[PDB]
Design a binder for this molecule. Structure first.
Ligand SMILES: [Cl-]
Ligand SMILES: [Cl-]
Ligand SMILES: [K+]
Lengths: 221, 220
């Protein structure tokens, strides 16, 4: 469990390192990535190619919640969905602000969805053209379906950010996972501000006899 | 009136429906004309004249759908869960849960169809008398079409019966938040402790929606 595995792909990043829990999809992933990477890699990307697949090192079988955004930040993507080491990205700041109001943690310097017990943050498409949101949907299409399908065999709740972004994706996903498709952190009329999806997640988990998420674990001090 | 109508080739011959269902009715008419003959050769619960009476309900004012798999094996009225003389196990076990939730002690019956914001639903719209799921093959496409339409309006889908709905809920082409609970009429008494009804108002209020007043269902 503690040792990562590796497969070769034809183009950058040439090797994909991954946790055992992802084994069932890797052969397909390699096939699909070899099909599109040449086209994809002609653009500067967020994240860089060496970071495309680093989230495949995260275990899945101990996760109960996936928090999913459509693609990486248009700039400064780290390969960890939502992660902003300087805490400048609007999405993670708005998320932090909701969690602050939820948890009573008023003083903090950042927030990270990838250090919370039971939560896997996820970017549906694994790259975009640097500076251009959703620009690589055409390349990731089949890979993105493959990976999300795999994730939702493990998690109990899937929380998707952006109704236009995800209502179709969520609708067409055939899975027993419980879906919540909410407003995106930058929705007009400040709709995300009144959004209580993180609380809803915990209600659904507890209804299903599972432990709630401690969202305060995401804070950086 | 907000009421519309279409004709079909067999009984019930005409369907009157609220405007909110307009987008699915052309397709529904097409499907029903194919299968009506199978549904009419049998004695059915409910009778064909009652198959579609729920299509008279508006959908824009609904925020919860409470869904069972098909009508009662006998005495179906076309209103899901309804028992005019309060003699069906499902609606009696539902009333007892609502009684515990609301604290209403004395009552003579319960009806999910008289509650603001709730649409009670049967996934399949008939069964052969005395046999549950006996018309699933015939309703199949219509059932998918209608439930998908409902879930474009409601914010919570509450399905009763884990075996009945695990697969249907998984394949449902909707992003709606779905709760699949135990069946009220099961022998094993797990519905008695099921918190699904209680949690619906929790979910609605967290989603900035008005709660359901479940006590509206009681008949005195
Ligand atoms: Cl949105
Ligand atoms: Cl059940
Ligand atoms: K689902």
């Amino acid at each position: 469990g503690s040792h990562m595995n590796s497969v070769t792909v034809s183009h950058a990043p040439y090797t994909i390192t991954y946790h055992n829990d992802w084994e069932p999809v890797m052969s397909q992933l390699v096939e699909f990535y070899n099909e599109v990477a040449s086209w994809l890699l002609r653009d500067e990307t967020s994240p860089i190619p060496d970071k495309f697949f680093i989230q495949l090192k995260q275990p899945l079988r101990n996760k109960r919640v996936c928090v999913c955004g459509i693609d990486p930040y248009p700039k400064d993507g780290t390969g960890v969905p939502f992660e902003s080491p300087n805490f400048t990205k609007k999405s993670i700041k708005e998320i932090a602000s909701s969690i602050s109001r939820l948890t009573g943690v008023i003083d903090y310097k950042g927030y990270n969805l990838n250090i919370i017990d039971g939560v896997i943050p996820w970017n549906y498409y694994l790259s975009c053209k640097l500076g251009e949101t959703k620009s690589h949907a055409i390349y990731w299409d089949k890979i993105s379906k493959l990976l999300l399908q795999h994730i939702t065999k493990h998690v109990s709740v899937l929380y998707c950010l952006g109704k236009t972004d995800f209502s179709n994706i969520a609708a067409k996903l055939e899975s027993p996972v419980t879906t919540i498709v909410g407003y995106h952190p930058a929705a007009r009329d400040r709709q995300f501000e009144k959004d209580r999806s993180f609380e809803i997640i915990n209600v659904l988990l507890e209804l299903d006899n599972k432990a709630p998420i401690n969202w305060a674990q995401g804070f950086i001090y």
